[PDB]
């Protein structure tokens, strides 16, 4: 099936956005984790925690 | 051919923000990736391209990159007109490919919305169908539940919702519910209530006319 | 404007298609002037709807 | 300033054909390439075709390789796309762009699009009601009216207020596909209670597919 993963995007200003990924479970979650990772190279060193069997992140930037 | 994978589907962020999309090409395709950006039912508006080029008279918060087979468009300050799809394009071979699009929403602070109904004009009761409509007006967030009572009968499958595109100055959403019956069913009955539930709201609001009332 | 003898083949083709209506039959004969390269791809296409409305 | 304008599209039966046209201005499309790119309702862009009108040199989606043909003529500055064996998925906004103009490899300027709906059902004229103003649609002082548009195929409609010269504050809805296959949509707008039975106000709509103009006046009941 298709999901939808939701992130919260919460940096160390504590500027939060949100953000969306759609495909297959496995796809959708190795989109948001590539996303993070991209972020934290601006926004520093990167922390996801994983809700509701994975459905839904929290990923904090360390700034 | 050459795939154009986008992410996320949807950012969400408030003004002011940076915000950043993303776009990877399944093969390399150099520098050949062009940016669109698309709002208000227009056409495609080129931002960026060449992957890092900014086209002429496109604001300087636009911002294209690029790593590899991994693009990205960033913008610096996000505004409020900013809110719409973006598209990335390879032109690195034939066919040209698009991504399949972000949508970019401004995040703001909570407004109830305005709720208002409307009972059937009497010009359309003269055809057989009643159309009952009730009006959120200006609110922030989108979600909303809107439930029509017809002589306190909840209704089911008899509604359809229309909701505004995100307003360009205030990033605030309308939104529309319509109840249609026959003109039948409609003299049939007398209270028609739409509930409205919305985070603004401290609790559900109900609009209601009796038909026949001025 | 003129044409080889391929061309007037393609057009002799579509315009002998017995199911095809007149608005089909003019807009495939219509590609064919629009695009000499896509001969082949375009008489492919109106006989596939040529044999659908037998 | 450059500008396209893409024309010619319609409502078009299951293997019926089509013709679009791409009329070019301020520039010459001898100097560039020309793409058809279409968009279904609600889904992302999809390269349809390009040509180099100088050379003729044409390339074509897989998807509609043999059904459609483009093609160019310089001495109009006008590209076109014949659209034959239409199918319901074709159904699209079709816009044209140009590419490579001035040095710039991508698609610079577009064209407004030009809506081809591909189906068996008819035309149809919408109907026009008022929404009128009244003690249910005010508060804080402002009043909300509005028009509703109803029963019509194919899109598009179009609504303005007191022939564009009301603006602020309006609210036209996207159209909505209903269980009987016509379409619907509602505009409102939100005035100054103050004003009513003082200002007229009157939407315009245009449904071009069957001639429509209606001048609807709304007032209270």
């Known amino acids: 099936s298709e999901v939808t993963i939701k992130v919260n995007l919460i940096f160390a200003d504590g500027k939060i956005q949100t953000a969306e990924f759609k495909g297959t479970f496995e796809e959708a979650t190795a989109e948001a984790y590539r996303y993070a990772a991209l972020l934290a190279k601006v926004n520093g060193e990167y922390t996801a925690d994983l809700e509701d069997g994975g459905n839904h992140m929290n990923i904090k930037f360390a700034g | 051919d050459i795939q154009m994978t986008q992410s996320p589907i949807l950012l969400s962020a408030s003004v002011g923000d940076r915000v950043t999309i993303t776009c990877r090409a399944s093969q390399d395709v150099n520098t050949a990736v062009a940016w669109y950006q698309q709002r208000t039912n227009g056409s495609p508006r080129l931002l960026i391209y060449?992957?890092?080029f900014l086209y002429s008279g496109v604001p300087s918060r636009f911002s294209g990159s690029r790593s590899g087979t991994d693009f990205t468009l960033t913008i610096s300050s996000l505004q409020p007109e900013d809110e719409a799809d973006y598209y990335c394009?390879?032109?690195?071979?034939?066919?040209?490919?698009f991504g399949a699009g972000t949508k970019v929403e401004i995040k703001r602070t909570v407004a109830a919305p305005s709720v208002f109904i409307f009972p059937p004009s009497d010009e359309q009761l003269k055809s057989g169908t009643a159309s009952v409509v009730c009006l959120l007006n200006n609110f922030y967030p989108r979600e909303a539940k809107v439930q029509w009572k017809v002589d306190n009968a909840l209704q089911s499958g008899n509604s359809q919702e229309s909701v505004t595109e995100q307003d360009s100055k205030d990033s605030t959403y309308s939104l529309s519910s319509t109840l249609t019956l026959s003109k039948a069913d409609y003299e049939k009955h007398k209270v028609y209530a739409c509930e409205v539930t919305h985070q603004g709201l401290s609790s559900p609001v109900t609009k209601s006319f009796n038909r026949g009332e001025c | 404007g003129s044409y080889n003898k391929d061309q007037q083949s393609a057009f002799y083709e579509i315009l002998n298609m017995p199911n095809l209506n007149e608005a089909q039959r003019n807009g495939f004969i219509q590609s064919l002037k629009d695009d000499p390269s896509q001969s082949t791809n375009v008489l492919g296409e109106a006989k596939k709807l040529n044999e659908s409305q037998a | 300033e450059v500008q396209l304008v893409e024309s010619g599209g319609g409502l078009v039966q299951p293997g019926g054909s089509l013709r679009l046209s791409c009329a070019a201005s301020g520039f010459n499309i001898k100097d560039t390439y020309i793409h058809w790119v279409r968009q279904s309702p609600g889904k992302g862009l999809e390269w349809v075709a390009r040509i180099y009108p100088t050379n003729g040199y044409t390339r074509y989606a897989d998807s509609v390789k043999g059904r459609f043909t483009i093609s160019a003529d310089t001495s109009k500055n006008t590209a076109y796309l014949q659209m034959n064996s239409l199918r319901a998925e074709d159904t699209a906004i079709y816009y044209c762009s140009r590419w490579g103009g001035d040095g710039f490899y991508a698609m610079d300027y577009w064209g407004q699009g030009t809506l081809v709906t591909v189906s068996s059902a008819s035309t149809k004229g919408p109907s026009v009601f008022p929404l009128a103003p009244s003690s249910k649609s005010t508060s804080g002082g402002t009043a909300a009216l509005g028009c509703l548009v109803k029963d019509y195929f194919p899109e598009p409609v179009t609504v303005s207020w007191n022939s564009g010269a009301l603006t602020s504050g309006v609210h036209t809805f996207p159209c909505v596909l209903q269980s009987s296959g016509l379409y619907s949509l509602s505009s409102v707008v939100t005035v100054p209670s103050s004003s009513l039975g003082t200002q007229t106000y009157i939407c315009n709509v245009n449904h071009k597919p069957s001639n429509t103009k209606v001048d609807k006046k709304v007032e209270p009941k």
């Open positions: 060449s992957a890092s």
């Open positions: 394009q390879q032109h690195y071979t034939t066919p040209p490919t």
